[PDB]
Design a protein around this motif. Structure first.
Motif: not given
Ligand code: HEM
Ligand code: HEM
Ligand SMILES: CCN(CC)CCc1cc(F)c(F)c(OCc2cc(C)cc(N)n2)c1
Ligand SMILES: CCN(CC)CCc1cc(F)c(F)c(OCc2cc(C)cc(N)n2)c1
Ligand SMILES: C[C@H](O)[C@H](O)[C@H]1CNc2nc(N)[nH]c(=O)c2N1
Ligand SMILES: C[C@H](O)[C@H](O)[C@H]1CNc2nc(N)[nH]c(=O)c2N1
Ligand SMILES: [Zn+2]
Lengths: 414, 414
Positions: A1-24
């Motif tokens: 359940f990883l987190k990705v930040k924007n270091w210009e507005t301090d916006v933070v989004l939560t990525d759960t989609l990466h779990l459905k990922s398949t290829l390498e």
């Protein structure tokens, strides 16, 4: 359940989609290949065994996307393709399944910055095509449609899927519309250095070249594994934009121009395990791909030399930034010229804002958005655009577009 | 035995060094975090068990580097630190070992583009320091030495290593020389928005602020875990460069200036398992860090607004590229101003060429060179510099520099 930040507005989004990922990806815990151009996991042969889970995985997200997940229409579709994979050792996609798969290949393309438009894509079903002439006809209607008199529209044409592997449909052009490159006696290059091999392949097959700079190339179309044949797009369908600057009347004298339609043709579209070796897709240009990369790359058109000459710049000392100066003027000129002809083009500021906006809805209405920073950040003015300051998670979802080898290094010629 | 290509000259290099790599990256086979700013593997507490292999690993490469690998002087050094780690549960580095470890931390910094100079680094041993005043004295001699009247020289000062963890030496400044940031009544920001928290921490400890724009901050020095104390670098040691343009006589009126010495102070230096929580290091500026990032970042000085105003640009439409235009002039001005004062500065073209040149010898005389593309490519004119077209392998070797938490979120105050 990883987190990705924007270091210009301090916006933070939560990525759960990466779990459905398949290829390498190519990265390990002890190395990162985020900067390798064509990793082996991005390039493309499959059998009957693995073909069914790929069908199952695909069909399940397609019915999950119409609020009909697991119902009767799903379970019979599941058994119907299961049955048909027993029978043929392959299967055929419904028209609606092709439209969905295609649209989400675009959605999942982590190096695409334009993806805000992924839902608005026009899918042309060419799976009944059998001959190189037929391919030429589907492609002309693509170019006319997507071009729409300069009011560009997104589209993709899908030739029949690979099967045996030796009867493959392949457009040998990297883009439908490209300028020919010719080498000189002194080694120097006229036209476009990129295509100088492809230009000779076309002359190998009998292209009478009008050996100049901006010569639109012929299509080389390979149908059902047969040797490809030349076809010349009707000039009235190739829309071109002559480049002029809104300050410099000497800018016409340069004599540059560029085609309106970017339309990639050498890629492979992957849906539910099925491989479509020919699937040209078009959109509209962001300014920098022409003004920065096409025009000013060292081994492309390489015009910084002359633009600074007419601008009369400090071309002795590197630290004058004469290159940076000539590069910003070329991009203002690209944008202006395309705009003054009502030909759809987007600037790198507007497209990167839209992408951040797109990224926002993707993390909400989807749970993520695979993004490749190395490729999203425009090739000029990186840090004044908002994507430079946005962290991005890159991962490989399917349906997807993949690179494939070039057909002239594989096609059993005869 | 991986391969990395340059898609501008078709140069190919073979990386074997990545096999000696030890620390982790943050990426997995199914995800790439190449674009995360401060990954958890880049940030910094250790015990006595693991401390010996770290010593062994380090000592072995140090003697391998003087063509005395495995000899008598090695084997006794091995047993001597082994013995001393039994005794103390820690150990002390030789003066020559400190110089080597420090120089190779720089060498291994994959986000550093200046590393061509890694061998020419001046190491100041401050491991005898015991008091905040003593730290202030070592730091002043650092700043005077590295500044060298504008003829900048690379250097690093190394305060005593962490031990218990609660008696830690820490410079609370992020850089030795930084301009203060002050918030206004209307919320707006004067000076430097980055430091507005640190500026209040200094006023919390009694800094009488001359509330303006370019106010050099005081040092906050923490010695052996004691509460830090304020110290004002003698102004005659802080060299500043007033920014003027070689065309615009209105460029003075802007009134900008920048300090000569970039000197990072909040990092952690890791050698042979030993942790040096304070180790300020300085070099010289590449132009873009000031002209692009310091001046034109949205949440920094943010001057694109006014530079385009005096230039009188199309500030209504985004697609005029007025931002790109004002940004190239600001960087020509930075470079020129620093150069006209004999103050060492390097342009992003020359530094990226030198890095490719550096990368060349590193793959030959070393077998590789960890590089972080996301950080190497300059923040403007990306693709006209040769590093944009160079594939890079990122991996974590040691000795290394690491991020660490900020001391005011950890220091048991009293
Ligand atoms: C509609 C406007 C579009 C814009 C402005 C746009 C822009 C871009 C740009 C700048 C790139 C970077 C690649 C490069 O620099 O050469 C890219 C990559 C890409 N785009 Fe988009 N594009 C658009 C539409 C589309 C469409 C219609 C598709 C397919 C349905 C698509 C799929 C892709 C793919 C597959 C890549 C390359 C990913 C890779 O290299 O692996 N894009 N696009
Ligand atoms: C001599 C001239 C030098 C130049 C021109 C230079 C330039 C740069 C630049 C542009 C960055 C990118 C970081 C940013 O944009 O803020 C960087 C990062 C860095 N440099 Fe260098 N630098 C120099 C000297 C040094 C020295 C003396 C050291 C240490 C001994 C060093 C170690 C580092 C480290 C640790 C980083 C950051 C890596 C990270 O963020 O994890 N550099 N440098
Ligand atoms: C590895 C070699 N590079 C350069 C030749 C590949 C470049 C490339 C590969 C792809 F797969 C792409 F989809 C691609 O899309 C560029 C593009 C596409 C569209 C529809 C619109 C637009 N505005 N731009 C560009
Ligand atoms: C994560 C927050 N960012 C911005 C505040 C950190 C920036 C940063 C972190 C580091 F560790 C660095 F060594 C660094 O060096 C910049 C630098 C250093 C030197 C000696 C010379 C130069 N020309 N430039 C810059
Ligand atoms: C070395 C690197 O992988 C290569 O130059 C990439 C970098 N990022 C890019 N980004 C885009 N959009 N297009 C490109 O061609 C490239 N080239
Ligand atoms: C989101 C991303 O990690 C972040 O903005 C990075 C990108 N690359 C960078 N590169 C350098 N040299 N300095 C930076 O501050 C950054 N910022
Ligand atoms: Zn990675």
């Amino acid at each position: 359940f990883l987190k990705v930040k924007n270091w210009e507005t301090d916006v933070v989004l939560t990525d759960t989609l990466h779990l459905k990922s398949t290829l390498e990806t190519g990265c390990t815990e002890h190395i990162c290949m985020g900067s390798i151009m064509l990793p082996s996991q991005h390039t493309r042969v499959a059998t009957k065994d693995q073909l069914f889970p790929l069908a199952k995985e695909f069909l399940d997200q397609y019915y999950s996307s119409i609020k009909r997940f697991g119902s009767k229409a799903h379970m019979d579709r599941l058994e119907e393709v299961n049955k048909e994979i027993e029978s043929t050792s392959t299967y055929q996609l419904k028209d609606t399944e092709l439209i969905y798969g295609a649209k989400h290949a675009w959605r999942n393309a982590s190096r695409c910055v334009g993806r805000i438009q992924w839902s608005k894509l026009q899918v042309f079903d060419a799976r009944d095509c059998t001959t190189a002439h037929g391919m030429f006809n589907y492609i002309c209607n693509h170019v006319k449609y997507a071009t729409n008199k300069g009011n560009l529209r997104s589209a993709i044409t899908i030739f029949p899927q690979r099967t045996d592997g030796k009867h493959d449909f392949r457009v040998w052009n990297s883009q439908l519309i490209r300028y020919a490159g010719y080498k000189q006696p002194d080694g120097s290059t006229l036209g476009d250095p990129a295509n100088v091999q492809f230009t000779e392949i076309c002359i190998q097959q009998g292209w009478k070249a009008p050996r100049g700079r901006f010569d639109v190339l012929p299509l080389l179309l390979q149908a059902n594994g047969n040797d490809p044949e030349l076809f010349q797009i009707p000039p009235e369908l190739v829309l071109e934009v002559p480049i002029r600057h809104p300050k410099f009347d000497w800018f016409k004298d340069l004599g540059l121009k560029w085609y309106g339609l970017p339309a990639v043709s050498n890629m492979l579209l992957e849906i539910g395990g099925l491989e479509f070796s020919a699937c040209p897709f078009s959109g509209w240009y962001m300014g920098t791909e022409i003004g920065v990369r096409d025009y000013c790359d060292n081994s492309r058109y390489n015009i910084l030399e002359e633009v600074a000459k007419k601008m009369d710049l400090d071309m002795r000392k590197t630290s004058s930034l004469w290159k940076d100066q000539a590069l910003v003027e070329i991009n203002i000129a690209v944008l202006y010229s395309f705009q003054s002809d009502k030909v759809t083009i987007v600037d790198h500021h507007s497209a990167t804002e839209s992408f951040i906006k797109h990224m926002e809805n993707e993390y909400r209405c989807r749970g993520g958005c695979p993004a490749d920073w190395v490729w999203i950040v425009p090739p000029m003015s990186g840090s004044i655009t908002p994507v430079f300051h946005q962290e991005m998670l890159n991962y490989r979802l399917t349906p997807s577009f993949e690179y494939q080898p070039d057909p002239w290094n594989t096609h059993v010629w005869k």
